[PDB]
Design a protein around this ligand. Sequence first.
Ligand SMILES: *[C@@H]1O[C@H](CO)[C@@H](O[C@@H]2O[C@H](CO)[C@@H](O)[C@H](O)[C@H]2NC(C)=O)[C@H](O)[C@H]1NC(C)=O
Ligand SMILES: *[C@@H]1O[C@H](CO)[C@@H](O[C@@H]2O[C@H](CO)[C@@H](O)[C@H](O)[C@H]2NC(C)=O)[C@H](O)[C@H]1NC(C)=O
Ligand SMILES: *[C@@H]1O[C@H](CO)[C@@H](O[C@@H]2O[C@H](CO)[C@@H](O)[C@H](O)[C@H]2NC(C)=O)[C@H](O)[C@H]1NC(C)=O
Ligand SMILES: *[C@@H]1O[C@H](CO)[C@@H](O[C@@H]2O[C@H](CO)[C@@H](O)[C@H](O)[C@H]2NC(C)=O)[C@H](O)[C@H]1NC(C)=O
Lengths: 50, 98, 84
Amino acid sequence: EAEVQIDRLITGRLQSLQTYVTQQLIRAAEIRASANLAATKMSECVLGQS
Amino acid sequence: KRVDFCGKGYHLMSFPQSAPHGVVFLHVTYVPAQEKNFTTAPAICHDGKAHFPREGVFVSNGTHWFVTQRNFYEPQIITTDNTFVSGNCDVVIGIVNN
Amino acid sequence: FNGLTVLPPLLTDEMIAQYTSALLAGTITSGWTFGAGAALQIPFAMQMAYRFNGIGVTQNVLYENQKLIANQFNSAIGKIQDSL
Ligand SMILES: *[C@@H]1O[C@H](CO)[C@@H](O[C@@H]2O[C@H](CO)[C@@H](O)[C@H](O)[C@H]2NC(C)=O)[C@H](O)[C@H]1NC(C)=O
Ligand SMILES: *[C@@H]1O[C@H](CO)[C@@H](O[C@@H]2O[C@H](CO)[C@@H](O)[C@H](O)[C@H]2NC(C)=O)[C@H](O)[C@H]1NC(C)=O
Ligand SMILES: *[C@@H]1O[C@H](CO)[C@@H](O[C@@H]2O[C@H](CO)[C@@H](O)[C@H](O)[C@H]2NC(C)=O)[C@H](O)[C@H]1NC(C)=O
Ligand SMILES: *[C@@H]1O[C@H](CO)[C@@H](O[C@@H]2O[C@H](CO)[C@@H](O)[C@H](O)[C@H]2NC(C)=O)[C@H](O)[C@H]1NC(C)=O
């Protein structure tokens, strides 16, 4: 029974970890896109005149 | 027209090339070098009037005054054909007699 | 600590501030030329005149309205000091 309980805990924690990893990946992709846009703007109209 | 979009510095043109899973661009760029030094002035006063360059900037090596472009040095004799008059130079800062 | 940690960033505040200062100096005392080749010494007034000529206003306006422009810029920076 101890192994059954441990397996239940393991699968629950694995599901939680997978959800957290997926959310982190989504947020990282969004932040990367936003920072790429910011870098484009900085290279466009901070060095010269737009 | 936008600076540093494709290529470094002023852009001229580009050539595309294929790749197994992508594309390869070759940008041809224009870059200046061999700088110099000069003494400049913003405006020219003559007969109580102010003269401004139509396009370019005023330069002088010490004894004569010439007008050149922004990115190259081909001095030309200043005339009335490449300048225009606007009011009198009394409030302009940096005027020089000529 | 419960099995997780926060890695320190590679870039610190000091070098970032130095980079911002370098960019600011380049965009003030040199203009847009340093973004292509090598930086040039150009007085600020002529850079303002060129920037005005870029948008369609003749450069005479700037040289005939220098003091008013300076006062307006100073007031703008003073109010943006307190705005945020
Ligand atoms: C234009 O004038 C500046 C000011 O003197 C020159 O800059 C100096 O150049 C010498 C020669 O290498 C250096 O030893 C000095 O340290 C420079 N001064 C500064 C403040 O950096 C510049 O070289 C001149 N331009 C040319 C093409 O000679
Ligand atoms: C500044 O440049 C002008 C234009 O080249 C020089 O004026 C001429 O100089 C040459 C000698 O290099 C003389 O033979 C000419 O008679 C000058 N006048 C003209 C109308 O060509 C001037 O000497 C230069 N000054 C300095 C200090 O370099
Ligand atoms: C460019 O800068 C120089 C150096 O500051 C200015 O020369 C000063 O001129 C004022 C009056 O015009 C004098 O009271 C100072 O004594 C001068 N300084 C030195 C070191 O002699 C020059 O006026 C400036 N040019 C312009 C157009 O503003
Ligand atoms: C530029 O030319 C003007 C016009 O002649 C000069 O202004 C005169 O200078 C003389 C001699 O200094 C004075 O006696 C006059 O009173 C001035 N005014 C007029 C209306 O003649 C001026 O000095 C010259 N130099 C500069 C740097 O502006």
